[PDB]
Amino acid sequence: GLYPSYNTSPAAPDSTGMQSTAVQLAGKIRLGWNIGNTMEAIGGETAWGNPMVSNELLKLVKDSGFDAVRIPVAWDQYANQESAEISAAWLNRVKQVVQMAIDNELYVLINIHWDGGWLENNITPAKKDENNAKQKAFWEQIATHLRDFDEHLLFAGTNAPNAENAEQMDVLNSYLQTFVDAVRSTGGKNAYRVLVLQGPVTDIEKTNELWTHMPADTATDRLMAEVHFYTPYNFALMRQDESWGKQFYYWGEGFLSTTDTERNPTWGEEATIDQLFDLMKTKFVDQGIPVVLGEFSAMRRTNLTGDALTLHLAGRAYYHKYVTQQALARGLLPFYWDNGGNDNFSSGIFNRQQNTVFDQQVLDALLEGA
Numbered sequence: 001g002l003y004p005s006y007n008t009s010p011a012a013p014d015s016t017g018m019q020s021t022a023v024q025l026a027g028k029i030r031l032g033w034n035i036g037n038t039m040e041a042i043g044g045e046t047a048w049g050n051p052m053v054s055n056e057l058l059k060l061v062k063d064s065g066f067d068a069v070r071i072p073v074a075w076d077q078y079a080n081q082e083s084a085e086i087s088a089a090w091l092n093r094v095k096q097v098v099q100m101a102i103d104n105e106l107y108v109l110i111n112i113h114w115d116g117g118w119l120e121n122n123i124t125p126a127k128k129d130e131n132n133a134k135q136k137a138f139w140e141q142i143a144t145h146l147r148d149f150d151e152h153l154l155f156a157g158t159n160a161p162n163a164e165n166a167e168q169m170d171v172l173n174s175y176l177q178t179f180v181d182a183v184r185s186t187g188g189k190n191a192y193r194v195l196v197l198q199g200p201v202t203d204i205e206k207t208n209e210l211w212t213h214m215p216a217d218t219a220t221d222r223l224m225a226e227v228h229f230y231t232p233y234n235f236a237l238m239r240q241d242e243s244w245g246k247q248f249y250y251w252g253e254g255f256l257s258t259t260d261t262e263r264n265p266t267w268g269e270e271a272t273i274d275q276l277f278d279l280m281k282t283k284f285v286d287q288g289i290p291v292v293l294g295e296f297s298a299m300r301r302t303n304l305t306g307d308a309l310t311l312h313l314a315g316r317a318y319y320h321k322y323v324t325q326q327a328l329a330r331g332l333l334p335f336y337w338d339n340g341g342n343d344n345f346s347s348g349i350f351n352r353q354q355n356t357v358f359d360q361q362v363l364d365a366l367l368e369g370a
């Protein structure tokens with residue numbers, strides 16, 4: 001015991017308002033939004049340029065057509081590093097935000113995010129035992145504190161764990177088992193709550209190659225799997241050319257350039273996307289396990305001008321419609337990555353500071369795709 005037990009008030013199993021299976025829950029969610037660069041920001045909730053989450057932002061997200069939110073949360077910067085005790089004020093603030101999302105009729109997925117890298121960059125034998133102790137300490141405290149919410153609240157163990165081979169997968173499987181067991185041990189509605197488990201780097205290919213088994217659960221049929229999607233990188237996140245490839249400015253049948261053809265895609269087009277989602281339909285969906293697509297988005301290139309600017313924005317939108325539609329046909333639940341920015345290379349579709357829509361084009365695209 002590197003840390004004290006934080007499972008000091010376990011409750012009797014309770015299935016009141018927890019009656020859906022993972023499959024039945026997935027059936028109610030077609031379109032999700034990440035509260036990005038907010039509760040997981042290093043230095044505090046407002047340290048990366050966004051305001052504190054408000055009832056009126058969450059009301060906008062619902063009234064705009066979203067069924068759910070993913071809330072990345074930071075934890076380690078708020079904890080005593082001797083005891084792994086998390087600040088009681090932070091635990092109360094996260095509870096308050098969950099309460100507000102549930103009051104607006106959203107499903108809610110809370111995680112431990114990158115969180116400064118303590119677990120995420122450390123999927124190794126050297127770090128396995130200390131990280132298993134922290135994972136257990138933090139999840140005992142988070143689940144105890146959020147124990148009383150109904151099935152609108154889901155928990156996700158990790159974000160994008162850096163596991164690249166089989167030895168790293170075994171280490172991750174251990175991390176994921178410590179999660180499940182910590183949650184169930186606190187015994188509320190947490191006896192039956194749907195938990196979400198992350199594939200290696202939440203990458204589709206690595207997950208296809210390396211994924212073996214889902215963790216063991218005292219509960220029956222209450223697990224989903226998680227991947228993310230920034231494919232192709234050159235289009236969605238690349239901000240400068242390298243020896244190994246060029247930024248793509250344009251995407252999709254119908255929206256390719258005739259004047260500027262090096263800035264069209266050399267790979268990662270409609271058919272590749274179809275192929276990638278199919279791998280997750282076979283491994284998980286066809287086998288009674290829903291798949292959360294926890295993060296996707298291509299960034300705005302508002303440094304372009306003229307017909308270049310207009311063609312980029314037309315393909316950028318189609319990219320978002322196509323991903324959403326094709327994800328949902330295969331049983332993947334699409335959650336849009338929104339960092340809140342409205343400047344060059346950002347992903348915010350709302351203006352957080354005025355609670356208005358900033359990018360009506362991409363919002364329309366996600367809804368048409370849904």
Ligand SMILES: O=[N+]([O-])c1ccc(O[C@@H]2O[C@H](CO)[C@@H](O[C@@H]3O[C@H](CO[C@H]4OC[C@@H](O)[C@H](O)[C@H]4O)[C@@H](O[C@@H]4O[C@H](CO[C@H]5OC[C@@H](O)[C@H](O)[C@H]5O)[C@@H](O[C@@H]5O[C@H](CO)[C@@H](O)[C@H](O)[C@H]5O)[C@H](O)[C@H]4O)[C@H](O)[C@H]3O)[C@H](O)[C@H]2F)c([N+](=O)[O-])c1
Pocket residue numbers: 036037047048049114159160201202203206228229230231233237295337339
């Ligand atoms: O071949 N594979 O196996 C394979 C694996 C992975 C691949 O792609 C990567 O997948 C991972 C997981 O999905 C991605 O991580 C998520 O990515 C989000 C978007 O990241 C980008 O945002 C914009 C750019 O800044 C940059 O391209 C990327 O970071 C990410 O959100 C961003 O979080 C930033 C903070 O970063 C910290 O936490 C995440 C962590 O990975 C990163 O190491 C760490 O530093 C935000 O940046 C901050 O912004 C504030 C405010 O302006 C500044 O003040 C700070 O200085 C600055 O740090 C950023 O704005 C936000 O969008 C999610 O947190 C994360 O889960 C990863 O991006 C993919 F690269 C691929 N593949 O080919 O794509 C293949």
